Write a protein that binds this ligand. Structure first.
Ligand SMILES: CCCCCCCCCCCCCCCCCC(=O)OC[C@H](COP(=O)([O-])OCC(O)COP(=O)([O-])OC[C@@H](COC(=O)CCCCCCCCCCCCCCCCC)OC(=O)CCCCCCCCCCCCCCCCC)OC(=O)CCCCCCCCCCCCCCCCC
Ligand SMILES: CCCCC/C=C/C/C=C/C/C=C\C/C=C\CCCC(=O)O[C@H](COC(=O)CCCCCCCCCCCCCCCCC)COP(=O)(O)O[C@@H]1[C@H](O)[C@H](O)[C@@H](O)[C@H](O)[C@H]1O
Ligand SMILES: CCCCC/C=C/C/C=C\CCCCCCCC(=O)O[C@H](COC(=O)CCCCCCCCCCCCCCC)COP(=O)([O-])OCC[N+](C)(C)C
Ligand SMILES: CCCCCCCCCCCCCCCCCC(=O)OC[C@H](COP(=O)(O)OCCN)OC(=O)CCCCCCCCCCCCCCCCC
Ligand SMILES: CCCCCCCCCCCC(=O)OC[C@H](COP(=O)(O)OCC[N+](C)(C)C)OC(=O)CCCCCCCCCCC
Lengths: 469, 64, 171, 86, 114, 76, 303, 92, 89, 184, 86
């Protein structure tokens, strides 16, 4: 369904004008919507945690992969709606959010790479999917190359990801040299006990986790997120993280790892404290993503963590999309635009937003409280599942670090709300232009999901218990 | 109950429509036909999820 | 198994074969005679060869040391058939192997000598040449007429022998 | 009219190539002992020439059709000692 | 074994590179006459030159197309062994590549100055 | 002078327009699409009428699927 | 040992003499339509000896152009190196041959020469795509990378006859590969290396499409003339094979100098557009049809 | 249209010759393959007999060098009792 | 493997130190990929297994595609297209 | 004869060391490109020594006639219209290298007593004083080479990988076009 | 997957050991997986020959510390040109 979309897009975009980009992106938006709503019945293949191997043991298929797959389509639909649909029908918003001719094709190829990462069963398939995603994401980062701020980020991301992919390939080839194999099916309890292949898996996890940017290799991706266009940043900071973390969770190669635990604690501390030292919105959200990545990395130290990870990644994806879309909507209520690519930079520019759109500030307050973990929002429940999982395995110091990190992060989360509920006497230079109904509906749906998804907690728990056991 | 689940889903759709209207700086009763559309769509999603839940319980009970 | 590398030296072993196992004469024919007589060897000694393999897979790793006896049987059968050829059809066999050596070991360029050897063996050795796995609809490659591919140069004395035979009428 | 001066170096190249190829054919025949060369040899062919060299006593590509080999072939089998690839 | 060689070689050549790079700390401070470039004057009067995007695209796209062609070599070496299944796979491979070739033809990305 | 009539407006008119106005692309597509299509629509016909496919060639020794029989001859 | 040395010396002398004499041949052909530099340059290059790699570039490019000849056969097995990967080795040497123009453009330290080198390099790689495509198309009928193997399969029919448009495409791409019109101290090195590459491309076309050393069948002629194998018969057959191969080579050479002294020169942009808009779509069509044609009639070549 | 029709005939006649050449070469390859099939049992057994002789020779050589030392030579490095040809010869 | 690992080490440390020498950093990327391919091919030869060589050719193709993308990035970064668009629309 | 052929591999290794040092220790980008071309040649010779001449040919084809050619082409584009590249200071990043490398040395140093039972592993790793025995068998009848096996596995066992690499080559076609030309 | 295929399209060097190990794993369960330790040890030995290397090292150490002669047929090395001669 994705390969056919990619081929059809190359063919159709080849023979189309530049003005047809919005229409093509809308067409793919409804195409993916129909793919989800019409082919969703494939979840019947995974009753009682039934697992399949596809393409000569090169791919794995179970309920976990299916759910991550559907979540990636939902995120792709939201992000592509952000490109096809025009927020405001005026020339300025025309200029800021204008998709490139190849952006949708690169987006779909990156989705394909992420899915192949999630579904990988062999190191050859894993490396090929990693390279596909990496090259696609480099091209996504570089496709807006009319600024040196974006150009330096593109070049840095290319080089750092090249080093990381080389390290991943080196680890995979060391594993092959040790075992003369390219799959995890040759690893059993006896295999792990008899031979010391732990360091190979530690190196592989290191290379994979550095691609999403855990400490002490966080600064480069934070700079990249700061400097890329915000409609690009919303995508490049979610999908690769989801793919890498899902592959790491399903691989289950870091049980009670000291190195992984220490790096997770370092990631949490760096994300929490460094967020306090931020005056830019993009850097603040980058450190927020770092803290969430540390939270999810804490789940890599124990088994039977599928439910907690799935719940947390879904709620975090929804909250991430919601917060970036709130930041996008707030662009209309500022008197000047920083760059063509990043129109808002500093948190101080959101000052007094409650006097321009009080319900936008209400939605932002809901999403920020969910980030902090205020009940009964989804973020609190995800953090609670993480706490239950870590206390079931006896990680008490990890739990204390988690609680302290959340308390520290609450300060710079409430920084946003405190700035936004201030008073701005400077009235707007713009008035009464109507915001897009489709994008507003999507943002409101995300906010309502965050607010009232705790209704279906028992239903989701039962579905997990029947479809994952 | 199925009726209660449908009512809750429709109410969530109405809340989403109301929030969308208020975000756009528009009156609460702006496009009531949009309220109907949103309620119908969210009620349908709730019905699908309730059917999935019922099938899940059936599968849980059948292996006994 | 892969071939050798940049540096490799051949080391020769002069240790005697263990006395417990019996000693058997072994085939001395070079590449061309073996290529010439492979079909006859197979036709005569297929059951011994099949027993040899079946033991090789049944031993499951120790085929070299556990399947000695039928291997001795196979090499004895090969020696017997080669002795029959070397006392039976000297001329035709010499024609065939010399032509094959002169024709880069390709059976296409020596159909006349192949036919002569085949008639000799079928006439007074009670062995027939055939290629397995061929349906009756298609006709065997070695019995073709007007071939698609011609040899670069036809062998002179082989063609002379063929002409002399066809004057005799043996063919 | 046909320009012979223009075609003279072409003819020189033609004759040089012809003579070189003939000399190469003669040299290959002399090296092979009066027989044609072997081309496109696989692992099986290489093993066959190795066995033939062992049988004939190292006399090039000489072929013998004798059923019974001399006693020398019972002990002349040689294995290859590959240098360890670092 | 590769990991061991890597880990122990890191400190030695790392220190060597560290020392040889602390050397340039001060060196040729490029005090050359960089005055006409910090103002915006030109002294060429010529040597403008140009490069259409299609030229550099020909140069760059020589590489992926050459990789596409050289990927066909493994197929032609095992064409008989994988006859029909491999034939279909190669057809799909070629059609996917021709999708990109159609992209580069329709876009007219490779047409030099007209 | 010449303008594209559009493929969807008329298939055969566009085919003639491509054959007469864009020879290289038209022929490229012609030979390119002939291959798979002619294969699909002619290979069963060739198998049925012209000649059946050849028997598979051996890849290794054909191992008989049977037990070891007792043989006599060429003993020590 | 001695035989190999004599053979390689004879082949090197013959190749060098042919390359040197083709310059005179081209000059005389141009005149009718309308050497000694290596010795002086080698001492100069030795005197010069980062300057190191830049100085060693021209002669090593010439050495690569000459090594391109080590695999060219003059008969069954008649070659300096009988490589099972002769096609791949030939392709690799042809790929390496593009460095000559680039390094020669650097040699002069001149902007105009650098533009010339850039344009030449882009044209060479553009038509290297075509050459490699045609190589693989030909290999699809053989399933072997041995040059002698392909030449031997061409006994049934020359691959030119089923692929005459492919012959025309290869001829055009060969004229355009070496910047030969109308498809247009280190200088002597690069000059002889360029002409060596020209002759190598002619040889490539010869053994890919024109049948190589084959000619009319002479089995009956040898049967009439000779009654047994002899060195005279081997010499005669080698002479026949080499004469046929050399006459095909000379025909291709004459075609190259003819198009040089023929249809008017074309502009560079048109030169690349002809490869990238007209030739490559046809070659991809052939990529699709040749395996399809073999699958239709169940004629996939064996190893 | 005469040249185009002739070109189809020239290409068609070439293909017919070329297509037929491949098919017969497959048959020739089939004959060549079956020739090597029959020769394997006699060639493989000869190598197998030599392998046993060399394997025992190394075992006899090794045990005599270590005479007077408390070590086990006949004990294979592998756990199974199957025959294993010795590898990694000591440089001469 | 010695040669591949040492090439990888030297190129990795050349990358870490320069880190601002985009031409040389991208060269170091290419050489690190070469060093990994050498190790993979040596282990494939030692084990007599085809997966090592298959992954080697896959790495070759991926390295080519990566090099093409990176050189396009350098073109965009250094403005190789040139401008001379003065006195124009 | 034997003395040189026993250490051909080590000579290639030493030449590779020299070429890599010359790559990472030059100023002109041309010098680094030419030395990595030499390094690719050395890698091809090393692959030939092992018995992978086909992989050496593939390297000389791709990495040199395409990758290195494009590298030199792009650098030549930078030189005709002289645009010197600005040289930024790495002394900014030197302190982190200091800290990390001191940490790594300390990590290798506190092992101390445990090195007596770990360094020995590398000690016998360096030795490798045994020659591989090459034995012959006749279980192979088909003229199958390395490239044939590559094609077989890539077209049958891992055809999905071939299709995904087709998509990768598609990406490598689309991307340069997307970020190099200005549409309309 | 391409596992278990050699460089010539056949069965790789350690096909038998890997086959035996996977058969043992299939015939056993997770609790009884410890019984299949010798199969994995043999597979690793076929991969790297560590125990074989140690045994050869011990044999060489014993040999190099001896001065008395050896009365046993040793191994003779001959040039490639001298294969089958005499
Ligand atoms: C080869 C081997 C076979 C496979 C490939 C076959 C390709 C055949 C191409 C024929 C048309 C060639 C052509 O001239 O097209 C225009 C163009 C060049 O001509 P042009 O006039 O210069 O174009 C400029 C236009 O003016 C400007 O452009 P435009 O405005 O005319 O629009 C161009 C447009 C239009 O371009 C085309 O029309 C070309 C492609 C046509 C594909 C047709 C597929 C139809 C599938 C649905 C059929 C049923 C419909 C529903 C019916 C009711 C059911 C209840 O391009 C597209 O959007 C591409 C097609 C989109 C996807 C279509 C396929 C969907 C998937 C089908 C899966 C198969 C299911 C099998 C089920 C089996 C059941 C047992 O060439 C191409 O587009 C290249 C081929 C594209 C292939 C895709
Ligand atoms: C499993 C759980 C996962 C996710 C749960 C999320 C959503 C639940 C499912 C589906 C949600 C879809 C609902 C469809 C019903 C929504 C609906 O009334 O239409 C639209 C937006 O419509 C989407 O933009 C429809 C967007 C469809 C996709 C939404 C996905 C988020 C809202 O009316 P509206 O008053 O703005 O309507 C328009 C009116 O039609 C025009 O005539 C006027 O010119 C214009 O000003 C305005 O009044
Ligand atoms: C008409 C077809 C449209 C369907 C398209 C669905 C796209 C899903 C995309 C993005 C995620 C959004 C939330 C999905 C809810 C989880 C479903 C499930 O139950 O999660 C379970 C697994 O729970 C888990 O581990 C944890 C899940 C974490 C959810 C976190 C969000 C909580 C709030 C959401 C409550 C829903 C509000 C609906 C209001 C009417 C997968 O269930 P399953 O694999 O057995 O298949 C389900 C049957 N299906 C495919 C028809 C749907
Ligand atoms: C496989 C193909 C391999 C080669 C690929 C070549 C790539 C060319 C891509 C391309 O651009 O083609 C579309 C082309 C564009 O048209 P144009 O008017 O030039 O558009 C200008 C854009 N502003 O459009 C054209 O002008 C060409 C369209 C020609 C389509 C007709 C030929 C299709 C073949 C049908 C007949 C086949 C033979 C008979 C079969 C009978 C049974 C079905
Ligand atoms: C798209 C392609 C469609 C072409 C359809 C033409 C069919 C005409 C019928 C004649 C066949 C025949 O009668 O001659 C038979 C021939 C040869 O077989 P044989 O050995 O003599 O038969 C004996 C069968 N045994 C060996 C099993 C005993 O078979 C052919 O392969 C020849 C086909 C003609 C050339 C087609 C090439 C296609 C053009 C390629 C342009 C790129």
């Amino acid at each position: 369904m994705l390969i056919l979309a990619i081929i059809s897009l190359i063919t159709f975009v080849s023979m189309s004008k530049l003005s047809d980009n919005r229409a093509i992106i809308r067409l793919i938006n409804i195409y993916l919507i129909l793919v989800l709503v019409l082919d969703s019945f494939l979840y019947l293949l995974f009753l009682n945690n039934q697992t399949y191997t596809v393409m000569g043991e090169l791919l794995i298929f179970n309920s976990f992969t299916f759910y991550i797959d559907m979540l990636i389509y939902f995120i792709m639909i939201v992000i592509s709606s952000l490109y096809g649909y025009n927020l405001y029908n005026n020339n300025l918003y025309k200029t800021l959010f204008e998709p490139k001719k190849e952006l949708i094709i690169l987006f779909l190829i990156n989705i394909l790479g992420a899915l192949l990462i999630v579904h990988s069963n062999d190191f050859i398939t894993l490396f090929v999917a990693i390279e596909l995603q990496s090259y696609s994401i480099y091209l996504i980062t570089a496709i807006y190359n009319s600024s040196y701020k974006a150009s330096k980020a593109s070049m840095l991301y290319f080089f750092m990801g090249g080093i990381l992919s080389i390290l991943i390939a080196y680890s995979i080839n060391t594993y092959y040299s040790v075992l003369n194999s390219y799959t995890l099916h040759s690893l059993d309890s006896l295999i792990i006990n008899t031979l010391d292949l732990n360091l190979i898996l530690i190196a592989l996890s290191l290379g994979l986790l550095f691609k999403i940017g855990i400490a002490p290799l966080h600064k480069w991706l934070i700079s990249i997120y700061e400097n890329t266009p915000i409609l690009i940043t919303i995508y490049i900071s979610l999908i690769p993280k989801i793919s890498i973390l899902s592959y790491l969770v399903l691989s289950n190669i870091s049980i009670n790892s000291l190195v992984i635990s220490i790096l997770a604690i370092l990631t949490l501390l760096v994300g929490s404290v460094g967020g306090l030292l931020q005056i830019k919105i993009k850097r603040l959200l980058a450190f927020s993503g770092l803290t969430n990545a540390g939270y999810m990395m804490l789940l890599l130290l124990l088994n039977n963590n599928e439910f907690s990870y799935l719940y947390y990644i879904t709620q975090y994806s929804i909250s991430h999309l919601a917060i970036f879309m709130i930041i996008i909507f707030s662009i209309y209520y500022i008197n000047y635009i920083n760059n063509q690519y990043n129109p808002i930079i500093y948190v101080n520019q959101l000052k007094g937003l409650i006097h321009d759109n009080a319900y936008l500030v209400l939605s932002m307050a809901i999403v920020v409280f969910s980030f902090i973990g205020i009940p009964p929002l989804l973020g609190f429940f995800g953090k609670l599942n993480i706490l239950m999982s870590i206390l079931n395995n006896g990680y008490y110091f990890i739990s204390i670090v988690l609680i302290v990190a959340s308390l520290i992060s609450a300060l710079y989360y409430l920084y946003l709300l405190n700035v936004s509920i201030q008073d701005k006497n400077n009235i707007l230079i713009n008035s009464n232009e109507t915001v897009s109904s489709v994008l507003s509906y999507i943002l409101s749906s995300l906010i309502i999901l965050i607010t009232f998804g705790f209704i279906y907690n028992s239903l989701i728990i039962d579905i997990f218990n029947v479809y994952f056991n | 109950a199925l009726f209660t689940s449908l009512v809750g889903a429709s109410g969530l759709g109405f809340a989403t429509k109301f929030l969308s209207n208020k975000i756009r700086l528009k009156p609460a009763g702006y496009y009531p036909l949009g309220y109907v559309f949103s309620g119908v769509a969210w009620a349908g999603l709730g019905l699908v999820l309730h059917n999935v839940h019922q099938h899940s319980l059936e599968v849980l009970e059948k292996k006994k | 198994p892969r071939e050798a590398a940049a540096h490799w030296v051949p080391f020769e072993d002069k240790a005697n074969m263990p006395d417990n196992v019996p000693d058997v004469v072994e085939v001395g024919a070079t590449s061309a005679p073996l290529l010439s007589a492979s079909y006859f060897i197979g036709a005569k000694c297929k059951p011994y060869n099949d027993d040899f393999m079946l033991c090789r897979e049944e031993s499951q790793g120790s085929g070299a040391i556990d399947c000695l006896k039928e291997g001795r049987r196979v090499t004895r059968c090969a020696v017997s058939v080669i002795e029959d050829i070397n006392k039976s059809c000297l001329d035709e066999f010499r024609l065939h192997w010399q032509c094959l050596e002169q024709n880069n070991h390709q059976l296409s360029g020596c159909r006349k000598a192949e036919a002569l050897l085949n008639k000799c063996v079928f006439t007074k050795l009670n062995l027939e040449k055939k290629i397995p796995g061929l349906r009756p609809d298609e006709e065997p490659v070695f019995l073709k007429k007007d071939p698609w591919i011609k040899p670069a140069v036809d062998d002179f004395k082989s063609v002379r022998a063929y002409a002399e035979a066809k004057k005799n009428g043996t063919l | 009219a046909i320009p012979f001066e223009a075609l003279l170096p072409y003819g020189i190249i033609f004759g040089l190539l012809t003579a070189g190829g003939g000399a190469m054919q003669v040299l290959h025949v002399y090296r092979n002992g009066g027989v044609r060369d072997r081309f496109a040899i696989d692992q099986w062919d290489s093993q066959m020439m190795e066995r033939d060299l062992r049988l004939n006593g190292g006399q090039g590509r000489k072929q013998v059709d004798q059923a019974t080999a001399p006693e020398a072939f019972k002990h002349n089998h040689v294995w290859k000692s590959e240098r360890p690839l670092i | 074994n590769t990991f061991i060689i890597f880990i122990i070689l890191i400190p030695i050549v790392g220190f060597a590179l560290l020392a040889v790079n602390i050397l340039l700390a001060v060196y040729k401070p490029y005090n050359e006459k960089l005055g006409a470039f910090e103002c915006g004057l030109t002294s060429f009067n010529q040597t403008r030159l140009a490069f259409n995007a299609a030229f550099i695209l020909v140069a760059i796209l020589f590489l992926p197309f050459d990789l596409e062609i050289s990927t066909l070599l493994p197929y032609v070496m095992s064409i008989y062994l994988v006859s029909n299944y491999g034939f279909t796979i190669v057809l799909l491979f070629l059609l996917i590549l021709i999708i990109g070739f159609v992209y580069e033809i329709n876009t007219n990305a490779l047409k030099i100055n007209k | 002078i010449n303008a594209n009539p559009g493929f969807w407006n008329g298939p055969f008119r566009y085919l003639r327009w491509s054959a007469h106005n864009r020879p290289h692309l038209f022929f490229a597509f012609a030979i390119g699409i002939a291959g798979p299509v002619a294969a699909l629509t002619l290979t069963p016909l060739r198998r049925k009428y012209l000649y059946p496919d050849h028997s598979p060639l051996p890849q290794s020794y054909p191992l008989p699927q049977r037990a070891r029989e007792q043989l006599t001859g060429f003993d020590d | 040992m001695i035989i190999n040395i004599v053979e390689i010396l004879i082949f090197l002398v013959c190749v060098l003499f042919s390359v040197a004499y083709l310059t005179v041949a081209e000059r005389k052909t141009l005149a009718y339509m309308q050497y000694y530099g290596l010795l002086q340059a080698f001492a100069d290059a030795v005197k010069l000896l980062n300057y190191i790699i830049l100085v060693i570039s021209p002669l090593i490019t010439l050495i690569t152009a000459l090594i391109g000849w080590v695999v060219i056969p003059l008969g069954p097995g008649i070659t300096l190196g009988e490589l099972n990967l002769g096609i791949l080795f030939s392709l690799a040497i042809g790929s390496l041959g593009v460095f000559g123009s680039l390094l020669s453009g650097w040699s002069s330290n001149s902007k105009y020469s650098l533009l010339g080198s850039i344009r030449s390099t882009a044209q060479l790689i553009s038509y290297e795509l075509i050459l490699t495509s045609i190589f693989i198309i030909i290999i699809m009928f053989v399933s072997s990378l041995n040059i002698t193997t392909i030449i031997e399969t061409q006994r049934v029919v020359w691959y030119c006859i089923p692929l005459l448009p492919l012959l025309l495409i290869f001829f055009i791409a060969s004229v355009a590969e070496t910047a030969r019109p109308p498809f247009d101290s280190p200088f002597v090195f690069f000059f002889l290396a360029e002409y060596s590459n020209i002759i190598l491309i002619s040889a490539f076309n010869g053994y890919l499409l024109l049948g190589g050393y084959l000619s009319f069948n002479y089995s009956y002629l040898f049967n009439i003339l000779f009654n047994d194998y002899s060195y005279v018969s081997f010499l005669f057959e080698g002479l026949i094979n080499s004469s046929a191969y050399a006459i095909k080579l000379v025909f291709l050479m004459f075609s190259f100098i003819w198009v040089r002294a023929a249809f008017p020169r074309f502009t560079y942009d048109n030169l690349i557009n002809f490869c990238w808009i007209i030739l490559l779509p046809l070659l991809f069509g052939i990529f699709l049809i040749i395996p399809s044609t073999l699958y239709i009639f169940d004629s996939f070549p064996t190893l | 249209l005469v040249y185009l029709a002739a070109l189809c005939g020239i290409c068609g006649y070439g293909f017919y010759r070329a297509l037929g050449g491949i098919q017969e070469r497959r048959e020739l390859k089939r004959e060549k393959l079956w020739a090597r099939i029959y020769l394997m049992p006699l060639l493989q057994a000869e190598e197998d007999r030599q392998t046993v002789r060399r394997s025992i020779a190394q075992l006899e050589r090794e045990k005599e060098i270590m005479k007077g030392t408390g070590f086990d030579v006949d004990k294979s490095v592998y756990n199974d009792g199957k025959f294993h040809a010795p590898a990694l010869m000591i440089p001469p | 493997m010695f040669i591949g690992t040492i090439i990888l080490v030297l190129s990795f440390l050349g990358f870490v130190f320069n880190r601002r020498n985009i031409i040389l950093a991208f060269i170091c990327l290419e050489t690190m990929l070469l060093g990994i391919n050498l190790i993979l091919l040596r282990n494939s030869v030692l084990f007599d297994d085809i997966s090592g060589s298959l992954f080697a050719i896959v790495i070759i193709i991926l390295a080519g595609v990566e090099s093409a993308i990176g050189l396009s990035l350098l073109v965009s970064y250094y403005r190789l297209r040139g401008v001379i668009n003065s006195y124009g629309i | 004869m034997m003395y040189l052929t026993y250490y051909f591999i080590e000579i290639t290794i030493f030449l590779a060391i020299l070429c890599t040092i010359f790559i990472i220790s030059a100023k002109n980008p041309m010098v680094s490109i030419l030395y990595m071309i030499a390094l690719f040649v050395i890698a091809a010779m090393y692959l030939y020594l092992i018995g992978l001449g086909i992989f050496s040919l593939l390297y000389i084809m791709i990495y040199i006639g395409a990758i290195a050619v494009l590298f030199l082409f792009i650098i030549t584009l930078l030189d005709i219209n002289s645009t010197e590249l600005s040289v930024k200071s790495n002394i900014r990043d030197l302190p982190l290298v200091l800290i990390s490398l001191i940490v790594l040395t300390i990590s290798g140093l506190m092992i101390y007593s445990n090195d007596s039972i770990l360094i020995n592993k590398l000690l016998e790793a360096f030795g490798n004083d045994y020659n591989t025995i090459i034995t012959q068998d006749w279980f192979n009848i088909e003229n199958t080479t390395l490239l044939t096996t590559i094609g077989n596995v890539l077209l049958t066992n891992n055809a999905f990988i071939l299709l995904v690499l087709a998509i990768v080559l598609l990406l490598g076609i689309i991307g340069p076009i997307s970020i190099t030309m200005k549409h309309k | 997957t391409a596992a278990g295929i050699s460089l010539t399209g056949g069965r790789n060097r350690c096909f038998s050991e890997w086959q035996s190990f996977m058969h043992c794993t299939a015939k056993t369960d997770a609790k009884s997986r410890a019984q299949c330790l010798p199969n994995f040890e043999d597979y690793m030995e076929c991969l790297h020959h560590t125990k074989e290397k140690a045994r050869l090292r011990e044999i060489e150490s014993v040999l190099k510390q001896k001065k008395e002669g050896l009365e046993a047929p040793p191994v003779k090395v001959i040039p490639v040109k001298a294969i089958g001669l005499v």
